[PDB]
């Protein structure tokens, strides 16, 4: 809806500070997005606004399309996706900055 889809990218490796989350994330990150939806930077006041919009649209769209295939995400998945998509949305912002 005026949103672009960026190129696929490496999913960042997150350390959570405890072995359970660390292992859960490593084993499940293939289920999470590896490209983000974004609007052009020129439609946002600052980077924080670009990023928050990017996180929420990406996760919402990812939840919808994977649900049709039978995916089931729990709260742990959503909070991990919020953390990894946040970093990937920051990267997308930086990729759009490199266009200059």
């Amino acid at each position: 809806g005026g949103y672009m889809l960026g190129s696929a990218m490496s999913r960042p490796m997150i350390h959570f500070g405890n072995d359970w989350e660390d292992r859960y994330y490593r084993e499940n990150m293939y289920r999470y997005p590896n490209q983000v939806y974004y609007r052009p930077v020129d439609q946002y006041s600052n980077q924080n606004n670009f990023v928050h919009d990017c996180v929420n649209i990406t996760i919402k769209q990812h939840t919808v399309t994977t649900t049709t295939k039978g995916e089931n995400f729990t709260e742990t998945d959503v909070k991990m996706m919020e953390r990894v998509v946040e970093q990937m949305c920051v990267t997308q912002y930086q990729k759009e900055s490199q266009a200059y």
Partner: antibody
Amino acid sequence: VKLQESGPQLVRPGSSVKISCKASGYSFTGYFMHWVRQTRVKSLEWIGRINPYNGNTNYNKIFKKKATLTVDKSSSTAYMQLNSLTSDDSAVYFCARSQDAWDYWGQGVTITVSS
Amino acid sequence: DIVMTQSPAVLATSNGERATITCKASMSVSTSTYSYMDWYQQKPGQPPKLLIKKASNNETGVPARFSGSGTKKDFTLTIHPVQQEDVSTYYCQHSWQTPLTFGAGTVLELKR
């Protein structure tokens, strides 16, 4: 980690109430917040949850339009407002922090709906 | 909603002996690597206290005489040896989806 709820309330049938849940000691937006009530029969009845990160909510739809969940990120406080209360809504209401498990709870708020 | 059938409704157990609480879910709440079952303990006048999450992981500070086990549809909370402070009502709860529904509860009481 602490979840601190507002005090007990006596409300007349048909009116509204707003209960607060002040969180401290952790990243407020990093966890969902659930609201649940424990009835006279000791059964747990789910009201809904909110994601403080983006404000998204999921409600016990059997309730209809009885409850509204909000957060104030500035004060890291969660609010549950209940509308059009009846005597059957008398119960202890809890907020609880969650990531696939309710690991920290508020102390409970006893609401009595009575004339 | 997922229905969890918890039994027994009531349980009397001698000091130092073994108590076992069972939860059967109406559908699977596991994958081959993780099971989505929690156990709580509630004492009078207090909110429930989380003892075990993801079927088998003790919360910090919970003594090791509590243990969670099972998979798929069948889950168990075991207490051994049971101590006097263990008298209370215990609940299972799945975390597979919302709502995170509860079993009806088990009132555990000590003999003496």
